Amino acid sequence: SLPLNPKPFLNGLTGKPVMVKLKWGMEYKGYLVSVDGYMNMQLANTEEYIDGALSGHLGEVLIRCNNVLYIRGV
Amino acid sequence: GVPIKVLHEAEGHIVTCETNTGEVYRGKLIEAEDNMNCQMSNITVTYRDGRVAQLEQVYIRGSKIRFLILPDMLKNMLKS
């Protein structure tokens, strides 16, 4: 696309199912409620996938920005 | 910072530098930046296994320095 930046991409993905990988290898799937300037992230109906396998169903979750490796829409 | 001024004072002197990874670099300090970035020359490097090597020219990023040893020629900033 004509330049698609970090910030708009993430904003487009609000209201959507996402999965976030953390640096530590945990993964969290849920609906992205919001993100902020520092790229802290809020998920609803979160699920946890560790070793790529469903571990725990967690609900509403804040992820501190420094933990994030990458975010994927899914 | 006061330590930074004392570092700049050691430019032109032989100094020792340990990195964050524990490699030990000894030689002449050519340039020291405000952020602790260090240009040195005619180095002896002593790795974590104990082995030595020789380098003509190096530059180490300030953040990745654990510490520096400076001459005692400087010790004599006593105001602070």
């Binding site: 696309s1 330049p3 930046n5 970090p6 790229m39 990458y70 | -």
Partner: protein, 79 residues
Amino acid sequence: MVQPINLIFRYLQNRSRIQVWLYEQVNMRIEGCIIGFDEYMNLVLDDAEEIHSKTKSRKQLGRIMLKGDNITLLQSVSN
């Protein structure tokens, strides 16, 4: 002189496929086509992949935003 940010701007324009070296993790690297990026070197990658150097295995990701925290190094790949 080439400035590093500009190189990226070039990668962006070219749509060259890019391989990223991550910080303090050697066994995995990330790949994709830079669509956009920001002041923090955060990247938007398309049709992205996790590359396991040990397992020779690739994990398919699609639309990725990688935080710049992880960036060690940026290279281009012909594929």
